[PDB]
Write a protein that binds this ligand. Structure first.
Ligand SMILES: NS(=O)(=O)c1ccc(CCNC(=S)Nc2ccc(I)cc2)cc1
Ligand SMILES: [Zn+2]
Length: 258
């Protein structure tokens, strides 16, 4: 009886195994655009992905991760609200059964069809497992997906998903350039929060871009053909793998822009 996204093991249950689920800095949150304050002190954001080394794509039973070589400073995030250097380790998405839901963050209670998380860890903690134990251990870059025009830079991901249909399957996934998943603008909101899946650790500086990327109906339909189950288990489509908005509590969402 492991955590997941069903009726019996979904987000409303997680607090029983992971009591931090009801903590003071949980994610995701609703971004109230009228309440978020421009912070002129935010340094410019630096996304340096030119040397990124992708290795593998993995269905982990909750989502699929595109994993990077993080054994040196290649692909890094710096600036914005961050002190120091954060190394890209993986990206993944959350998505819906229908185009009207799927994002974890919301904007004035609007849900997007999906949300991309580019996960980075603070190099001053030496490894990812040490970084998740620290309040400034991770920086997750969150990007909304809406359905419209295809995202050309996403199609290499869409085309390998047939090869990792079920939980525990992986495939080689070299030379993928995550710059092809970015919108034009790097304007963002930022707040202190958590991982959005168990173990729900309060270790994340969230950086959520205001400009969504557009993906096609056919691209998101291929995400929804993935399976939560393992091979030779009953088929359960990998859809609605999102946690809903959590209470903001004693936090302020800061805007990088006027
Ligand atoms: N949705 S999200 O963006 O907030 C998100 C991001 C990341 C995670 C991965 C948690 N893994 C952990 S805690 N330990 C771990 C430690 C070392 C290694 I190498 C692998 C695993 C979860 C959720
Ligand atoms: Zn995520």
């Amino acid at each position: 009886h492991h955590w997941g996204y069903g009726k019996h093991n979904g987000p409303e249950h997680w607090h029983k195994d992971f009591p931090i689920a009801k903590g003071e800095r949980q994610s995701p949150v609703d971004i109230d655009t009228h309440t978020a304050k421009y912070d002129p002190s935010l340094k410019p954001l630096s996304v340096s992905y030119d040397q990124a080394t992708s290795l593998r794509i993995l269905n982990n039973g909750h989502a699929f991760n595109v994993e990077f070589d993080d054994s040196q400073d290649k692909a890094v995030l710096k600036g914005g609200p961050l002190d120091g250097t954060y190394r890209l380790i993986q990206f993944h998405f959350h998505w819906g059964s229908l185009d009207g839901q799927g994002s974890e963050h919301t904007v004035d209670k609007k849900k997007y069809a999906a949300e991309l998380h580019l996960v980075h860890w603070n190099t001053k903690y030496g490894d990812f497992g040490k970084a998740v134990q620290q309040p400034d251990g991770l920086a997750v870059l969150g990007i909304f997906l809406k359905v419209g025009s295809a995202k050309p830079g996403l199609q290499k991901v869409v085309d390998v998903l047939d090869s990792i249909k079920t939980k525990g399957k992986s495939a080689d996934f070299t030379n993928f350039d995550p710059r092809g998943l970015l919108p034009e603008s790097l304007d963002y909101w930022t707040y202190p929060g958590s991982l959005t899946t168990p173990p729900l650790l309060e270790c994340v500086t969230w950086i959520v871009l205001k400009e969504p990327i557009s993906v096609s109906s056919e691209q998101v339909l291929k995400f929804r053909k993935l399976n939560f189950n393992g091979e030779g288990e009953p088929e359960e489509l990998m859809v609605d793998n999102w946690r809903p908005a959590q209470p903001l509590k004693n936090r302020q969402i800061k805007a990088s822009f006027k």
